Design a protein around this ligand. Structure first.
Ligand SMILES: *[C@@H]1O[C@H](CO)[C@@H](O)[C@H](O)[C@H]1NC(C)=O
Ligand SMILES: [Cl-]
Ligand SMILES: [Cl-]
Ligand SMILES: [Co+2]
Ligand SMILES: [Co+2]
Ligand SMILES: [Co+2]
Length: 374
């Protein structure tokens, strides 16, 4: 009776929101796997979806030589000796080829021209590049450890991050703006900003295993005009009707989008199972309460239906603030189904929910599926 599971076109579309199914790992901190280097088992990011706007914010001293930018090269021994504690620089792999050719960041133009790179989108080409890049051990032998990446979609640069850590905190473990001075590491944590670094896309290398998969399987963009919901008692209940939903006031829809990533319940693999598998309070929407206040509803329930609401926007921890598809995830061949028709289009009513005294109404309006309770 659920229209969003009724026809396959609808089902397929709704699948992209199931981060347990496709992404399958932590989002805030992604450490879903473990791989051996130099006889040592290291935690490895593993998630299959790109995480839009995610960046790692550093807490280095606010002064030279420190840049507080995780895309800077990992420091050389000499740079570290020059700075003293904490480590300066960032997370970027600083290695060069036997030629002396820099490995990261790597320009998308060269990946586009590399016949061995099969992905059909620039974001996919970066992920594939990361998937085909493995850590070399102390004996310069290949391992199965793959570094995570950041795609800089503005500069069209693919960063391979030698530092795969995503969160460190506590004065026992790391320093904030140089205090305690005895510690090697500065503190850092993942972040999404209402205004900054929307052009940065974080991912595990395993986004690149089947590079074109994220296009259909991942909730890359915000969804305008609908509230996420769950099919219960023959109708679609948006999150505000569920008991375990967190509802909070926000000043803007972008604050809500940030909350779906930064709230304490988001899928995360950090100590800090320790393997979330993608389970978590990853889902939310902005809406306007009857009193006119902007609010944000957050849930760990994977949506399986939608409720129409022209003033709402549904977000996930994985996706972007924008509802608009950017050109760097539109495939350059016609075989791969593009990311964007699923919700276009008889007035259908459903059995009365006596418990709430409302009924489903599934219709078509403005060439677009309506779904509400009456
Ligand atoms: C989401 O995916 C998981 C894993 O495949 C599955 O167990 C669950 O039933 C799915 N839920 C929805 C709402 O599709
Ligand atoms: Cl001290
Ligand atoms: Cl001391
Ligand atoms: Co699936
Ligand atoms: Co593990
Ligand atoms: Co923006």
């Amino acid at each position: 009776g659920n229209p969003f599971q009724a026809n396959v076109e609808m089902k397929t579309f709704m699948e992209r929101f199931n981060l347990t199914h496709h992404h399958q790992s932590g989002i805030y901190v992604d450490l879903g796997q473990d791989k051996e280097v130099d006889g040592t088992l290291y935690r490895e990011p593993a998630g299959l979806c790109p995480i839009w706007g995610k960046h790692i914010e550093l807490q280095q001293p606010d002064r030279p030589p420190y840049r507080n930018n995780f895309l800077e090269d990992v420091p050389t021994e000499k740079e570290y000796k020059q700075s003293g504690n904490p480590l300066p620089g960032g997370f970027n792999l600083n290695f060069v080829t036997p030629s002396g050719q820099r490995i990261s960041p790597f320009p998308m133009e060269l990946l586009e021209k590399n016949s061995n790179i099969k992905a059909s989108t620039d974001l996919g080409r970066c992920a594939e590049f990361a998937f085909k890049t493995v850590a070399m051990d102390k004996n310069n032998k290949a391992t199965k450890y793959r570094y995570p990446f950041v795609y800089d979609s503005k500069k069209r640069l693919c960063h391979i991050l030698y530092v795969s850590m995503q969160l460190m905190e506590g004065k026992k473990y790391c320093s904030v703006k140089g205090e305690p001075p005895d510690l090697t590491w500065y503190c850092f944590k993942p972040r999404k900003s209402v205004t900054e670094n929307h052009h940065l896309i974080y991912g595990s290398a395993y986004v690149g295993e089947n590079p074109d998969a994220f296009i259909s399987k991942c909730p890359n963009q915000a969804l305008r005009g609908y509230r996420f919901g769950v099919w219960k008692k023959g109708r679609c209940l948006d999150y505000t009707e569920l008991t375990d939903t967190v509802i909070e006031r926000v000043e803007s829809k972008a604050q809500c989008w940030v909350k779906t990533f930064e709230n304490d319940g988001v899928a995360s693999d950090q100590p800090g199972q320790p393997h979330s598998g993608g389970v978590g309070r990853n889902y939310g929407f902005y809406y306007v309460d009857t009193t006119g206040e902007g609010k944000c509803a957050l849930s760990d329930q994977v949506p399986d239906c939608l409720v129409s609401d022209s003033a709402a926007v549904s977000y996930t921890a994985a996706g972007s603030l924008s509802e608009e598809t950017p050109n760097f995830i539109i495939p350059s061949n016609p075989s791969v189904t593009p990311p964007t028709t699923a919700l276009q289009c008889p007035d259908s009513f459903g059995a009365c929910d006596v418990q709430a005294c409302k009924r489903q109404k599934t219709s078509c309006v403005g060439g677009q599926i309506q779904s509400t309770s009456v």
